[PDB]
Design a protein around this nucleic acid. Structure first.
Ligand SMILES: [Cl-]
Ligand SMILES: [Cl-]
Ligand SMILES: [K+]
Ligand SMILES: [Mg+2]
Ligand SMILES: [Mg+2]
Ligand SMILES: [Mg+2]
Ligand SMILES: [Mg+2]
Ligand SMILES: [Mg+2]
Ligand SMILES: [Mg+2]
Ligand SMILES: [Mg+2]
Ligand SMILES: [Mg+2]
Ligand SMILES: [Mg+2]
Ligand SMILES: [Mg+2]
Ligand SMILES: [Mg+2]
Ligand SMILES: [Mg+2]
Ligand SMILES: [Mg+2]
Ligand SMILES: [Mg+2]
Ligand SMILES: [Mg+2]
Ligand SMILES: [Mg+2]
Ligand SMILES: [Mg+2]
Ligand SMILES: [Mg+2]
Ligand SMILES: [Mg+2]
Ligand SMILES: [Mg+2]
Ligand SMILES: [Mg+2]
Ligand SMILES: [Mg+2]
Ligand code: NA
Ligand code: NA
Ligand code: NA
Ligand code: NA
Ligand code: NA
Ligand code: NA
Ligand code: NA
Ligand code: NA
Ligand code: NA
Ligand code: NA
Ligand code: NA
Ligand code: NA
Ligand code: NA
Ligand code: NA
Ligand code: NA
Ligand code: NA
Ligand code: NA
Ligand code: NA
Ligand code: NA
Ligand SMILES: [Sr+2]
Ligand SMILES: [Sr+2]
Ligand SMILES: [Sr+2]
Ligand SMILES: [Sr+2]
Ligand SMILES: [Sr+2]
Ligand SMILES: [Sr+2]
Ligand SMILES: [Sr+2]
Ligand SMILES: [Sr+2]
Ligand SMILES: [Sr+2]
Ligand SMILES: [Sr+2]
Ligand SMILES: [Sr+2]
Ligand SMILES: [Sr+2]
Ligand SMILES: [Sr+2]
Ligand SMILES: [Sr+2]
Ligand SMILES: [Sr+2]
Ligand SMILES: [Sr+2]
Ligand SMILES: [Sr+2]
Ligand SMILES: [Sr+2]
Ligand SMILES: [Sr+2]
Ligand SMILES: [Sr+2]
Ligand SMILES: [Sr+2]
Ligand SMILES: [Sr+2]
Ligand SMILES: [Sr+2]
Ligand SMILES: [Sr+2]
Ligand SMILES: [Sr+2]
Ligand SMILES: [Sr+2]
Ligand SMILES: [Sr+2]
Ligand SMILES: [Sr+2]
Ligand SMILES: [Sr+2]
Ligand SMILES: [Sr+2]
Ligand SMILES: [Sr+2]
Ligand SMILES: [Sr+2]
Ligand SMILES: [Sr+2]
Ligand SMILES: [Sr+2]
Lengths: 53, 132, 337
RNA sequence: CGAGUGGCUUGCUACCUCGAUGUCGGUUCCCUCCAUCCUGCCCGUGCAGAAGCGGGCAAGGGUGAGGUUGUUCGCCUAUUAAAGGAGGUCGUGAGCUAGGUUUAGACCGUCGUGAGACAGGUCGGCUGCUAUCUACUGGGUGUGUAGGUGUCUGACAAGAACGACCGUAUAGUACGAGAGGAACUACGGUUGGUGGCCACUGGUGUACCGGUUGUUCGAGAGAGCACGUGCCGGGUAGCCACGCCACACGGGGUAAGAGCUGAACGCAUCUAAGCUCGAAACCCACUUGGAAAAGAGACACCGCCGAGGUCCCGCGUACAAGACGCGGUCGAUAGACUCGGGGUGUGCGCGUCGAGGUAACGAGACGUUAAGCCCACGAGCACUAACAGACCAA
RNA sequence: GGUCUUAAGGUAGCGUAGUACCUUGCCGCAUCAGUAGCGGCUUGCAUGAAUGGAUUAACCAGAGCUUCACUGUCCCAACGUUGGGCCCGGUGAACUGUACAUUCCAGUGCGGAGUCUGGAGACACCCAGGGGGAAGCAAAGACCCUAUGGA
RNA sequence: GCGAAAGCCAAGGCCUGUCGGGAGCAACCAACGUUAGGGAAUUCGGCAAGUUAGUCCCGUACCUUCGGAAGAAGGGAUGCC
RNA sequence: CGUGGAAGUCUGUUAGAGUUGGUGUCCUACAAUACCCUCUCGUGAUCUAUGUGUAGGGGUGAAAGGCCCAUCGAGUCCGGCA
């Protein structure tokens, strides 16, 4: 699988899956990505993220 | 009970306020007891995903308010572990009111449900829109 | 009438003091069922990683599906069985009779032992056989040592010596099997005794935590509410009643925590191999890089990294052996991050 | 109606203590009793089944969370296998609490001429001490057994190391007209307890990186201070639980009980002799400690002018002193450097853009730049430091 | 009862009260559950009018109760920070001491023993600890009674 | 900055709120920071802690002795150039 | 609508005065009444310095039997007194 935030290949047997109110599903590779996402930051705007570069 | 097929870290306690994910007329539920549970000294009795709980209706329609009914915990904010290692968590803590034969009191279920709760309570599954 | 509650901590691992030997000593051995063989092995703890595995249990609903299982990597290089000890059945229990040694000694063995120069392996062998004829032979065990030199991550070159039992068929046939292992050079591997999928018993001297209070040591409560702010936070209520006018050894008190021997039962051996397959990127934190003979033990193993752990075929297994599990993926991800 | 046991209730007495043995309830932590609430095994039934009712053995384990009340007790709610009782100075204030009782202030009611009283109510109202001995938890130093290293043995010691529940198949079957509805066994899980561990999830992380408010060093750059991080964001190692792993079966002997053979007593009789079975209880099994077990142990090798040990030195898988473990050039033990693996999130400077502004100036944007900065981990690497050298010893 | 003591015989109000023994009074509100709190009823053991009754906006480090919000008060504890604590140099008290003293289980004794009896256990010394016992230390009991005491 | 407020800094004063050295520095204690999910279940009692917060705009109930209640409540705004 | 600027008026660690809770710290103390946080009053029946008056069965007391030099339901000293 691939991270629905940063875009890196999630290591199998690792990570978290957040289930939104509507039913949408967001797979996260780390706590760092969950935190940046909860801050209201978008992956495309963060230079370190694979989606951006 | 039948194995959930997941390891749960109980996110609720006796006295906890949760959402009622159905069209019964009940909006907010209060956890009173957990079926089959027996704790230890000083421990607040814990409830989690897939547990059948006795509940109290806090907010809702006058006819549904103040009633003591049974319910099934359908969603929780605290993570659960799936056999493939991955952790899964929800937006809120929610439950579906149920009767004597484990059948839902309402007709329509609001919001998503965990696949593990579906395996255990079949009539709740075949009433759910989204199963994650 | 004040609620009941089980006591704080177990009384079966007492006294909670420092271990005499850092090298674990088994107090029990498996039965004599199959063919003659050495009843144990040893290695050095490396660290942890996860593995993806295919479910082996026929009674499990998830049979055939991919399951993520935690694993402790232990470097298990070949050991040397330098001697064979024989026990006699005296009215005071089992007492050591004689020992049969070798000529081929590992170069760095003189760091622990006073290496034999003049020995008689034939006369000692005869003594054991006369004791077998007399019907007074107890059991046969092999004096064994590790080669920490073969492990680059472990600083020690001083071999860890331990005794291991030989169990099997008849007493006559296992006496001969024991002598054959010894005579060569005593070189044996994990493969010789264990197979992947087998349940083993892992013994180890735990992580040393020095002196700790009753809360950490015995799992007692902290003072609650108002009682927490008076000058007493993590101290027990009382040391006992008025009568008996003494403090019982059963009351939870401060002292040594950690560095005790533990024998963890029924540990499934996921895989035995040789190579750089279980290594973590950037090396295992506070250990190093694994590139040699190893074992993947399911779950946790007592003791810290670099510590000598011991293996024994399960004396009390619950499940039936499900040999050679299908390992689809081994994590090589960095333990830093 | 009669006979008792206990010492939990109350009463009686006035033996002990008035140069003081702190007091109700609660809390916390430990041991125990059985008159057993649940769990195990049994007998009876007004025992079809299911569910009960009554009785026997049995104290291994368990017996929980909450609403009023200072309450003990109790009433009440929802869970539960069940939510048993009692002793330990009504266990426990040189442990805690101060709500109650129990001073000095005050009010109300009642009584009193009054001061004042109340075995009534009510608001407020103080809790000292550096442990000598002993006791236990852990840690050392000596002596004994009488040179050293390594490996063991097992007298004894501790354990609950496991207890309990739900579900599935059995089976909608046995049983019963029907309603209803089991078990043996085999499986999956949950719960409480227990021991250990950190790959994974989570917490911390006043290491570290970044944003940024006030002020000070003229601005810039870069810094100090704002409590022992100014605040906010992220967070490695480690330590952790809210995370993860592990914790039988089976033997042996019994209790209540079910029986066999069997006599006294030609029969009968589970008992008198003998025997087969049979409890979560007992013993073993399993884990932990354990040569100071005074019968003070065993084996093997090294050694008595030399085996080994100590000091010293570099360090931790160890650690409050002491102890323990590893390495010491025949070396990777620690540091430096370089990689790797990680944290943050794009450096200073310069270029272009930039709302405007005549210009001066200009918050900011992009590029250079996965940049800059940093790391409690790993690898490489003898470059620096593990040098020099002393002592004890049959 | 349909007067009598001793003059009158409780009027407005308020009322289970900071006054109500019975008492967790009854009904209701609220809660899963409310000896609480509030409302109503109220025969008030033994309310009540300047021994002031009642009512009340405002005020309050006054007493009780409820809701929203918040949170380590709790479930259940973890990690960290600073000063101690520990080791070293220097400085350097006090409380306390009939004697003896390694105790433990039972017993006995003025009935609540480290010291008596019977057993069990116990090699000596030292370090750290939390305080079970010395009916621990500190105070010729504040309570109770007593004295031909005091104020 | 509203300020004789906080915080920072001069002039001036001081390192004499006068014992030091060492251990990643253990238990335990005093002060304190942060804790997932839950959210008063704790307790006699939210004790302790926390939450809110400055300023402007909108808006503000019962009751009232017409003063008050009231900053009721509630909602929005807030920097730099 | 403005002006005006009243108040035993409000907020306020302004100075200053006081002392609610923590039943925190201390309790052979720093201290024979201390330390910290919290809290109250802060234009008035306000707070404060100095000077001065009231004396022991007497003062003084917005009253607690409070206070009258660590001494108060009758101060302290010496004497009566052995
Ligand atoms: Cl419950
Ligand atoms: Cl407590
Ligand atoms: K007394
Ligand atoms: Mg409790
Ligand atoms: Mg990690
Ligand atoms: Mg990661
Ligand atoms: Mg009985
Ligand atoms: Mg018992
Ligand atoms: Mg009582
Ligand atoms: Mg008592
Ligand atoms: Mg006590
Ligand atoms: Mg006390
Ligand atoms: Mg004390
Ligand atoms: Mg009270
Ligand atoms: Mg009171
Ligand atoms: Mg009433
Ligand atoms: Mg005492
Ligand atoms: Mg006296
Ligand atoms: Mg008196
Ligand atoms: Mg008199
Ligand atoms: Mg929290
Ligand atoms: Mg409670
Ligand atoms: Mg408070
Ligand atoms: Mg004057
Ligand atoms: Mg008085
Ligand atoms: Na204290
Ligand atoms: Na009797
Ligand atoms: Na009595
Ligand atoms: Na007493
Ligand atoms: Na008590
Ligand atoms: Na029992
Ligand atoms: Na109660
Ligand atoms: Na006591
Ligand atoms: Na008490
Ligand atoms: Na006290
Ligand atoms: Na048996
Ligand atoms: Na006032
Ligand atoms: Na805290
Ligand atoms: Na003295
Ligand atoms: Na003591
Ligand atoms: Na008097
Ligand atoms: Na006017
Ligand atoms: Na104060
Ligand atoms: Na006088
Ligand atoms: Sr052994
Ligand atoms: Sr043993
Ligand atoms: Sr206190
Ligand atoms: Sr005693
Ligand atoms: Sr009995
Ligand atoms: Sr039963
Ligand atoms: Sr409560
Ligand atoms: Sr009662
Ligand atoms: Sr008790
Ligand atoms: Sr009190
Ligand atoms: Sr009074
Ligand atoms: Sr009274
Ligand atoms: Sr001797
Ligand atoms: Sr069934
Ligand atoms: Sr049916
Ligand atoms: Sr600072
Ligand atoms: Sr703020
Ligand atoms: Sr029998
Ligand atoms: Sr010996
Ligand atoms: Sr009347
Ligand atoms: Sr009045
Ligand atoms: Sr102490
Ligand atoms: Sr200056
Ligand atoms: Sr000085
Ligand atoms: Sr943080
Ligand atoms: Sr409450
Ligand atoms: Sr607002
Ligand atoms: Sr004023
Ligand atoms: Sr108080
Ligand atoms: Sr102090
Ligand atoms: Sr004091
Ligand atoms: Sr405080
Ligand atoms: Sr003020
Ligand atoms: Sr005199």
């Amino acid at each position: 699988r691939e991270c629905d935030y940063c875009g890196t290949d999630i290591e199998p047997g690792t990570g978290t899956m957040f289930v939104h109110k509507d039913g949408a599903t967001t797979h996260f590779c780390s706590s760092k990505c969950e935190n940046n996402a909860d801050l209201g930051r978008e992956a495309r705007n963060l230079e370190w993220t694979d989606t951006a570069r | 009970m039948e194995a959930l097929g997941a390891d749960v870290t109980q996110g609720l306690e006796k006295g906890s306020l949760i959402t009622c994910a159905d069209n019964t007329g009940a909006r907010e539920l209060k956890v009173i007891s957990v079926h089959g549970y027996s704790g230890t000294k000083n421990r607040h009795p814990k409830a989690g995903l897939g547990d059948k709980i006795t509940v109290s209706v806090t907010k809702g329609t006058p006819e549904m308010r103040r009633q003591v009914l049974e319910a099934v915990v359908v969603r929780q904010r605290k993570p659960i572990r799936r056999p493939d290692g991955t952790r899964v968590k929800f937006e809120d803590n929610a439950a579906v009111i149920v009767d004597e034969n484990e059948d839902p009191r309402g007709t329509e279920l609001k919001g998503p449900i965990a696949r593990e709760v579906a395996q255990r309570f079949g009539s709740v599954a075949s009433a759910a829109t989204m199963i994650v | 009438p004040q609620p009941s509650r089980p006591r704080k901590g177990s009384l079966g691992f007492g006294p909670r003091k420092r271990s005499t030997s850092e090298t674990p000593r088994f107090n029990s051995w498996p039965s004599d069922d199959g063919q003659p063989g050495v009843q144990g092995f040893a290695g050095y703890k490396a660290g942890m990683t996860h593995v993806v595995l295919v479910n082996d249990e026929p009674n499990s609903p998830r049979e055939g599906m991919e399951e993520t299982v935690p694993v402790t990597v232990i470097e298990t290089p070949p050991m040397r069985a330098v001697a064979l000890r024989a026990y006699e059945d005296t009215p005071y229990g089992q007492r050591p009779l004689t020992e049969v040694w070798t000529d081929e000694f590992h170069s760095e063995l003189d760091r622990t032992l006073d290496v034999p120069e003049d020995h008689d392996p034939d006369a000692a062998e005869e003594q054991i056989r006369d004791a077998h004829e007399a019907g007074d032979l107890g059991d046969l065990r092999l004096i064994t040592h590790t080669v920490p030199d073969a492990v680059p991550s472990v600083p020690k070159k001083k071999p860890d010596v331990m005794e291991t039992r030989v169990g099997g068929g008849s007493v006559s046939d296992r006496l001969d099997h024991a002598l054959d292992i010894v005579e060569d050079g005593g070189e044996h591997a994990m493969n010789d005794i264990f197979r992947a999928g087998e349940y083993a018993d892992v013994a180890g001297v735990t992580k040393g935590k020095g002196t700790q209070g009753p809360v950490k040591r015995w799992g007692v409560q902290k003072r609650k509410g108002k009682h927490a702010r008076q000058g007493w936070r993590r101290r027990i209520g009382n040391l006992g009643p008025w009568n008996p006018s003494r403090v019982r050894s059963t009351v939870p008190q401060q002292g040594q925590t950690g560095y005790h021997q533990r024998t963890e039962l029924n540990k499934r051996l996921i895989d035995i191999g040789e190579g750089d397959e279980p290594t973590v990127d950037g090396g295992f934190v506070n250990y190093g890089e694994v590139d040699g003979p190893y074992t993947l033990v399911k779950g946790s193993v007592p003791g810290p990294d670099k510590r000598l752990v011991r293996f024994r075929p399960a004396v009390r297994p619950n499940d039936q052996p499900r040999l050679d599990p299908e390992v689809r993926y081994v994590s090589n991800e960095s333990n830093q991050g």
